Design an enzyme around this catalytic site. Structure first.
Site, PDB file in Angstrom:
ATOM      1  N   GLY A  15       2.979  29.077   6.731  1.00  9.83           N
ATOM      2  CA  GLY A  15       1.945  29.238   7.728  1.00  9.83           C
ATOM      3  C   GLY A  15       1.677  30.705   8.083  1.00  9.83           C
ATOM      4  N   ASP A  16       2.742  31.504   8.036  1.00  6.59           N
ATOM      5  CA  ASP A  16       2.665  32.952   8.160  1.00  6.59           C
ATOM      6  C   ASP A  16       1.600  33.527   7.199  1.00  6.59           C
ATOM      7  OD1 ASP A  16       3.187  35.727   8.513  1.00  6.59           O
ATOM      8  OD2 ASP A  16       5.079  35.686   7.544  1.00  6.59           O
TER       9      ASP A  16
END
Length: 127
Positions: A15-16
């Protein structure tokens, strides 16, 4: 990939990068800044403090479903065990949690819902 079973650090790892891609595109589309400023501008969207601020906003307004809030709760957690230096631990956990939620929706191909969360994050941070 079974996102519902995947550990939270892996979700956050994913998700980063997903959030980063949204943010960098947003910065280029707004334009009107020299490329040397892009990194610094991006930090105000992707730092621990920024991502935590988004999570506080989302939790406060009940923007998320219970399934999504369970992803966030899990996402705080267990971090690899070290915290980046001079970083407040709670801030870091809420940041990591945001990343887990983004990763989760990306890996389940929930593009529309992910758009909603990320565009909301951007609006919160720009307000």
């Amino acid at each position: 990939i079974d996102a519902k079973q995947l550990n939270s650090l892996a979700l956050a790892y994913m998700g980063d990068a997903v959030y980063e891609q949204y943010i960098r595109y947003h910065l280029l589309q707004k334009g009107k800044v020299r490329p040397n400023q892009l990194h610094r501008l991006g930090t105000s969207f992707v730092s621990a403090k920024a991502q935590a601020k988004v999570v506080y906003h989302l939790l406060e307004t009940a923007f998320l479903t219970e399934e999504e809030e369970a992803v966030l709760r899990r996402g705080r957690n267990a971090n690899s065990g070290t915290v980046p230096k001079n970083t407040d631990v709670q801030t870091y956990r809420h940041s990591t949690a945001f990343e887990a939620l983004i990763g989760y929706h990306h890996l389940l191909n929930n593009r529309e819902r992910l758009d909603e969360i990320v565009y909301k994050a951007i609006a919160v941070l720009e307000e």
